Design a binder for this molecule. Structure first.
Ligand SMILES: CC(C)c1nc(CN(C)C(=O)N[C@H](C(=O)N[C@@H](Cc2ccccc2)C[C@H](O)[C@H](Cc2ccccc2)NC(=O)OCc2cncs2)C(C)C)cs1
Ligand SMILES: CC(C)c1nc(CN(C)C(=O)N[C@H](C(=O)N[C@@H](Cc2ccccc2)C[C@H](O)[C@H](Cc2ccccc2)NC(=O)OCc2cncs2)C(C)C)cs1
Ligand code: HEM
Ligand code: HEM
Lengths: 463, 463
């Protein structure tokens, strides 16, 4: 029984139960579990996900070692998370040289030049969003911001990546949004995902049964969508710009990117660009609404840089320090990650401490983001933390909302800009106010993914 | 999750953990678990073996109902205990009409007439045992009684059932004993049996992999042993007597008993007649040695009925009240059963209480045997409890060392006599004394089967 390993290495931790490990402790959300474990254990601890030994680490240097120094040699892959099917070839799930080949190929997608060619493309979509909101602005009833941001983010990602205008904004009952949000119902009171975290030995078996954590009732829709919208649809080059679709087409003809492998990456992009982007935007608006001085101070920058509702540009976006601070701050309090993780591929002693092969190393981002060692009054939302005159007191290995090292978020620059353009255009025309149903203080979901327990509703007013 | 059933019926019990149920409580042996649950819960309680709801019952009337009144209609089978292979056809494992057909056929094996024809057959074996013990009597060093009783019991059962003299007594390194004791290594610190009690949904899968809880490295030896010792070995009838082997041969020719089905029953008989018989005999000798007045009072009866070491007979055995009392008493304190169990086949309300389909009903014999409600000073060994003048204060449904109703021990009369003849012949020539390594007070095995934690060693002296 691999359960005696952490006591056998002198590493502290909560007592494992047979078979379950410590999974019962996720009863109050694992973020809480992490915070407790930090308070009580220190720099370093160990616990079990079923039989799977995880090792939490909090030392900055040790974190840098793992994420950056030894990524290529030792800590190269994340943990396998369940029965995955064809999606084994998605970049974020892919391991070692198959991942590195995919990384190398998709790296060029998000260069400042490729990015600045999206500035005008999104610009046209920000106009549609503005208009959508003005419609509810005129009505004056609570908005579920994920709905409006969702379709926005979907329209943005679909056009930037493939060239296709699916027009999600002008479509409430939209198949592309409706299918994509059903993709991961991750939940521990959901008897399925619990059981593969506990019992991952059933994984090999479910693969052979073509069972995915992804409803095939989704992946088939997305498979058919991308199927010939790559093929007979994009043909005569025609208006062909910077689209990752082509970058995967262009590097198929004259190494070698398969067809199902192509669909697989697209799904990663569609999901990231929809769910992640829209969740964060919803989190910032909640903060800006529960903090009006912050919302105003921002609206002032927005007009100070773009004189009286002027159209945003690449260079214009980067200039705005306070807008970057507001985004960074929300991401401090609401990390979509909530844990960074790497599988130990061979044996190592990192900075005077030994990790055996097969162990999962886990950085508890959520916890470290709220640690009194690094953060003054870490509970409070304080954008001023990220000002030019305070960001040196910030440790680059305690604050990583995008991960770090060679496996960090490939989408960082895209999402930052995409989110900011959305914000600018929105605050440039509207102000946001608390509602009667607005969950204050907002509690997070007890289960898996970082989401509100109650969906975010707020009042919208034009200026 | 079937875990809310017992609170949903208003039936008390220890709080189930997800997946595990209450199995963690078997940490101190389930007998202890039962006693606690009795003390604290009362007449009736519920707990979970994994997802499997067990219901413990202690009411005499309710017990009689289950074992006797509703056996045929409702409580007909025991629980499936793991991957079983060809042994699915063994009588004790067999369900419903397939079991009833087998019962009906093997019932006649143990009639007083069939039994009295074994009296002279065992008589010859008791002579060999006596001699074996006299050899260690002359040496004067601690005896492991299971060794001597084992070979005795093996010789008895093999000759009575098949007609074959395998001569286990005159053979230390005997394949028949050495293979048979490896048949069930039942244990909870044994990671295998634990996991199928918890996770019996893996059973269907292991069957298809020809995995038995019985080492095939045993069943193949026993399969080949019985294989042609039935066939070309027993041919010209020749000396053919009362042997169950023939009773299964005789009712194959001119319903219909298969060949692998034949081997299956034999294994049940060989095991019962070896392990059960020899364990009890070891338990009585421990009691008789830790209680010399009891050993003497018995030796007096033995000679009072059989004048100066006379040869025992059927009728002679039955007469001896005190010998029956000593056997009954040891069986009160050391039930080889330790729980009686039945699967609820359809819905029922037994005496004003409702049981849903699929629930296991369990009588906690070990516990009830040591209950102050029925037994004075139940901890103490007191044969006098079973005297003609006290046995009315004994409830036939609290004391069932052989089970009750149509599924009770088919071997009851055989084992009683076989054990008694062994005892008579032994005490008729020897006295038994505590040793320096004799575990006092003797503790039972924490795990599954009723066995000593330490093997029983005692000193033997001739008279
Ligand atoms: C006990 C343990 C298994 C648990 N972890 C969590 C939450 N945490 C911390 C995770 O790392 N959860 C994992 C995850 O999403 N890993 C991801 C890397 C990551 C980690 C944290 C934050 C951002 C990206 C890596 C996986 O390949 C996922 C799986 C996936 C694929 C398609 C659609 C949805 C999801 N693919 C992603 O690339 O998601 C798209 C994203 C892009 N950018 C941010 S998310 C999986 C186990 C779900 C809940 S339970
Ligand atoms: C949680 C639960 C599953 C557990 N129970 C126990 C102990 N108790 C109480 C049992 O009932 N244990 C069960 C058992 O042996 N059942 C038995 C009926 C019984 C019950 C109690 C006392 C005497 C006979 C019924 C099963 O068919 C066994 C299995 C077997 C087959 C060949 C060789 C060895 C074993 N077959 C028997 O007929 O054993 C031979 C015997 C004949 N007479 C007494 S034992 C199995 C689950 C092992 C440990 S863990
Ligand atoms: C605010 C929005 C986003 C946040 C906070 C975010 C955050 C992260 C984080 C924390 C990781 C894991 C890094 C690590 O383990 O070290 C990650 C991985 C990744 N993200 Fe994002 N992300 C966002 C948006 C996007 C977008 C828009 C895309 C592209 C469509 C994207 C694509 C990816 C990919 C492909 C990976 C896997 C990297 C690899 O394994 O090579 N993300 N993201
Ligand atoms: C002291 C010795 C023995 C004891 C205490 C004993 C006890 C028991 C008990 C308690 C049961 C279960 C009854 C129930 O669930 O109600 C049982 C079943 C059984 N015993 Fe025994 N037994 C002994 C010896 C033997 C012998 C020698 C044989 C035959 C070789 C035998 C054959 C069986 C069989 C076949 C069953 C299953 C009955 C059925 O399902 O039809 N036992 N025994």
């Amino acid at each position: 029984h691999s359960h005696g390993l952490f006591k056998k290495l002198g590493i502290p931790g909560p007592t494992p139960l047979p078979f379950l490990g410590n999974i019962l402790s996720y009863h109050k959300g694992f973020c809480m579990f992490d915070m407790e474990c930090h308070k009580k254990y220190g720099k370093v601890w160990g616990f079990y996900d079923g039989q799977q030994p995880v090792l939490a680490i909090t030392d900055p240097d040790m974190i840098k070692t793992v994420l950056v120094k030894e990524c290529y040699s030792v800590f190269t892959n994340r943990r396998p998370f369940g029965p995955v099917g064809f999606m084994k070839s998605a970049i974020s799930i892919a391991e070692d040289e198959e991942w590195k080949r995919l990384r190398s190929l998709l790296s060029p997608t998000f260069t400042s030049g490729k990015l600045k060619e999206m500035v005008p493309i999104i610009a046209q979509y920000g106009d549609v969003l503005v208009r959508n909101l003005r419609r509810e602005a005129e009505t004056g009833k609570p908005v579920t911001l994920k709905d409006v941001f969702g379709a926005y983010s979907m329209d943005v990602i679909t056009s930037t990546s493939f060239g296709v205008n699916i027009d999600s904004l002008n479509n409430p009952q939209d198949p592309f949004v409706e299918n994509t949000k059903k993709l991961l119902r991750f939940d521990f009171l959901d008897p399925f995902f619990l059981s593969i975290t506990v019992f991952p030995f059933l994984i090999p078996i479910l693969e052979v049964l073509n069972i995915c954590v992804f409803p095939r009732e989704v992946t088939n829709f997305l498979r058919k969508s991308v199927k010939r919208m790559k093929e007979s649809r994009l043909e005569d080059t025609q208006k062909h710009r910077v689209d990752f679709l082509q970058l995967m087409i262009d590097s198929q003809n004259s190494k070698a990117l398969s067809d199902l492998e192509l669909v697989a990456q697209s799904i990663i992009f569609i999901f990231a660009g929809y769910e992640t982007t829209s969740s964060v935007l919803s989190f910032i608006m909640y903060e800006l609404a529960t903090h009006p001085d912050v919302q105003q101070k921002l609206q002032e920058e927005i007009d100070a840089v773009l004189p009286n509702k002027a159209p945003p540009t690449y260079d214009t976006v980067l200039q705005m320090e306070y807008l970057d601070m507001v985004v960074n701050e929300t991401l401090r309090l609401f990390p979509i990650a909530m844990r960074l993780e790497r599988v130990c591929k061979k044996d190592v002693e990192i900075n005077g401490m030994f990790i055996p092969k097969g162990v999962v190393v886990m950085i508890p981002s959520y916890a470290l983001h709220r640690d009194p060692k690094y953060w003054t009054e870490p509970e409070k939302f304080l954008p001023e933390r990220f000002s030019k005159k305070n960001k040196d007191n910030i440790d680059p290995y305690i604050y990583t909302p995008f991960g770090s090292g060679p496996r960090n978020c490939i989408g960082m620059r895209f999402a930052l800009m995409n989110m900011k353009l959305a914000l600018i255009r929105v605050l440039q025309n509207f102000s946001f106010k608390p509602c009667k149903e607005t969950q204050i203080p907002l509690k997070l979901s007890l289960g898996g993914l970082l989401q509100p327990e109650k969906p975010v509703v707020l009042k919208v007013e034009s200026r």
